[PDB]
Enzyme design. Structure first.
Site, PDB file in Angstrom:
ATOM      1  N   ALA A   1      23.967  33.582 -35.315  1.00  0.00           N
ATOM      2  CA  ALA A   1      24.958  34.542 -35.583  1.00  0.00           C
ATOM      3  C   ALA A   1      25.009  35.247 -34.183  1.00  0.00           C
ATOM      4  O   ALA A   1      25.880  35.566 -33.450  1.00  0.00           O
ATOM      5  CB  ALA A   1      24.887  35.642 -36.802  1.00  0.00           C
ATOM      6  N   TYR A   2      23.791  36.026 -33.766  1.00  0.00           N
ATOM      7  CA  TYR A   2      23.622  36.852 -32.773  1.00  0.00           C
ATOM      8  C   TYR A   2      23.699  36.294 -31.440  1.00  0.00           C
ATOM      9  O   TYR A   2      24.184  36.778 -30.361  1.00  0.00           O
ATOM     10  CB  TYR A   2      22.170  37.903 -33.016  1.00  0.00           C
ATOM     11  CG  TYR A   2      22.208  38.864 -34.115  1.00  0.00           C
ATOM     12  CD1 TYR A   2      23.068  39.876 -33.909  1.00  0.00           C
ATOM     13  CD2 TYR A   2      21.507  38.632 -35.232  1.00  0.00           C
ATOM     14  CE1 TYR A   2      23.231  40.950 -34.577  1.00  0.00           C
ATOM     15  CE2 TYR A   2      21.733  39.757 -36.134  1.00  0.00           C
ATOM     16  CZ  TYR A   2      22.382  40.728 -35.971  1.00  0.00           C
ATOM     17  OH  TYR A   2      22.589  41.737 -36.889  1.00  0.00           O
TER      18      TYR A   2
ATOM     19  N   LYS B   1      18.805  35.266 -23.426  1.00  0.00           N
ATOM     20  CA  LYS B   1      19.349  35.194 -24.622  1.00  0.00           C
ATOM     21  C   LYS B   1      21.001  35.374 -24.032  1.00  0.00           C
ATOM     22  O   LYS B   1      21.071  36.553 -23.537  1.00  0.00           O
ATOM     23  CB  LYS B   1      19.042  36.287 -25.610  1.00  0.00           C
ATOM     24  CG  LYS B   1      19.658  36.524 -26.854  1.00  0.00           C
ATOM     25  CD  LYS B   1      19.138  37.241 -27.937  1.00  0.00           C
ATOM     26  CE  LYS B   1      19.441  37.152 -29.296  1.00  0.00           C
ATOM     27  NZ  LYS B   1      18.302  37.829 -30.186  1.00  0.00           N
TER      28      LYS B   1
ATOM     29  N   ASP C   1      12.204  43.252 -31.788  1.00  0.00           N
ATOM     30  CA  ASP C   1      13.249  42.896 -33.046  1.00  0.00           C
ATOM     31  C   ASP C   1      13.522  44.478 -33.740  1.00  0.00           C
ATOM     32  O   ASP C   1      13.382  44.425 -34.810  1.00  0.00           O
ATOM     33  CB  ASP C   1      12.924  41.841 -33.830  1.00  0.00           C
ATOM     34  CG  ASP C   1      13.321  40.581 -33.342  1.00  0.00           C
ATOM     35  OD1 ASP C   1      13.743  40.357 -32.365  1.00  0.00           O
ATOM     36  OD2 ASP C   1      13.031  39.652 -34.453  1.00  0.00           O
TER      37      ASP C   1
ATOM     38  N   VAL D   1      19.367  31.234 -27.407  1.00  0.00           N
ATOM     39  CA  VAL D   1      18.458  31.408 -26.648  1.00  0.00           C
ATOM     40  C   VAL D   1      17.886  30.205 -25.685  1.00  0.00           C
ATOM     41  O   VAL D   1      17.775  29.333 -26.464  1.00  0.00           O
ATOM     42  CB  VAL D   1      17.218  32.158 -27.400  1.00  0.00           C
ATOM     43  CG1 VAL D   1      16.078  32.442 -26.429  1.00  0.00           C
ATOM     44  CG2 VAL D   1      17.490  33.123 -28.388  1.00  0.00           C
TER      45      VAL D   1
END
Length: 343
Positions: free
Chosen positions: A30-31, A49, A164, A34
């Site tokens: 989703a995000y 990323k 994170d 990498v």
């Protein structure tokens, strides 16, 4: 502006400065995708990323901005930092992709614990470093909100970084096991000490090799928690804003706090004492990171001259009501203005 080169790897376009070489996919989601890569300027192996579509909505635009601001700010040995941020865009008008570069993390703390209970000397050093990093993070008025073993990176020398950050859960799931009960059931506007609860959960697990509160859902988890730390008294109940939540708590048979020396059988008494201070149900009464560093359990490592605080962090943007393009233009300035750290 460096020279960029462009390629497709696993059906993602990577357009990155020539300094980054030997890109290989390590991730998609989703995000973000990498790659691992070699950074010829610094000599480190890095994670690059590429943010999927960071300006898709006002919430994503703001998320991107928040993340960038936060990673730009964090400068501490025990906290993840930004090596670089870049866009191939030559103007605001063509700006759409954001790439972030950090040190490539190998092993997380799950690797380390899943295998065993650790030695006490190891637990001291690992918890020391989380609390050092947390002192810094909290000194900036930042709350991590998602501390758990998978967000802690650990090397062969047992050196640790916090990763994170939670920057905006059902059933038998690891993520919920480390969360303070007041955030898990939304009992109140919460404190930085939600993170200290998390540290206690992690420390317990390092000492025993087992999850402290492995609840099969929110309720089963609460019961596990209340069995160890006791049921709320009047003083805490008064601070819980939901009337229904208060009624639910008062439906449960009252329970005393357990003796932690009979739970953490055979652990260092100083470790037991520290756990008792971190795992306090009332979040006003939990030990802070700065006080925990001064606790005798860390006498081998504590040095208040080498436990720095952060520069002030202006978080006024969180209240700001902007359009997508305004969040994007703010993010573009943050990309363009980036100054890398020392070699």
């Amino acid at each position: 502006r460096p020279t960029f080169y462009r390629q497709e790897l696993n059906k993602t376009i990577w357009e990155v400065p020539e300094r980054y070489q030997n890109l290989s996919p390590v991730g998609s989601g989703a995000y973000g995708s990498v790659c691992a890569a070699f950074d010829t300027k610094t000599g480190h192996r890095v994670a690059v990323k590429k943010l999927s579509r960071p300006f898709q909505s006002i919430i994503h635009a703001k998320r991107t901005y928040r993340e960038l601001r936060l990673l730009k700010h964090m400068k501490h040995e025990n906290v993840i930092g930004l090596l670089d941020v870049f866009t191939p865009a030559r103007s605001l008008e063509e700006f759409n992709d954001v790439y972030l570069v950090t040190h490539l993390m190998g092993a997380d703390l799950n690797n380390i614990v899943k295998c065993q209970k650790l030695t006490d000397d190891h637990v001291q050093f690992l918890i020391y470093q989380i609390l050092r990093g947390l002192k810094y993070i909290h000194s900036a008025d930042i709350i991590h909100r998602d501390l758990k073993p998978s967000n802690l990176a650990v090397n062969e020398d047992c050196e640790l970084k916090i990763l994170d950050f939670g920057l905006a859960m059902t059933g038998y799931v690891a993520t919920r096991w480390y969360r303070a009960p007041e955030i898990m059931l939304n009992w109140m506007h919460y404190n930085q000490t939600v993170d200290i609860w998390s540290v206690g959960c992690i420390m317990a697990e390092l000492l025993t090799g087992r999850t402290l509160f492995p609840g099969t859902d929110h309720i089963d988890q609460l019961k596990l928690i209340l069995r160890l730390v006791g049921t709320p008294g009047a003083e805490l109940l008064k601070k819980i804003s939901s009337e229904s939540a208060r009624n639910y708590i008062q439906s449960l048979a009252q329970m005393p706090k357990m003796n932690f020396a009979n739970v953490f059988i055979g652990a260092n008494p100083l470790a037991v004492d520290l756990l008792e201070k971190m795992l306090v149900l009332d979040s006003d009464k939990r030990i802070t990171a700065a006080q925990a560093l001064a606790h005798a359990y860390f006498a081998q490592y504590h040095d208040p001259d080498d436990e720095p605080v952060a520069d002030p962090y202006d978080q006024s943007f969180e209240s700001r009501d902007l359009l997508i393009d305004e969040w994007k233009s703010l993010t573009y300035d943050e990309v363009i203005s980036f100054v890398p750290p020392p070699l």
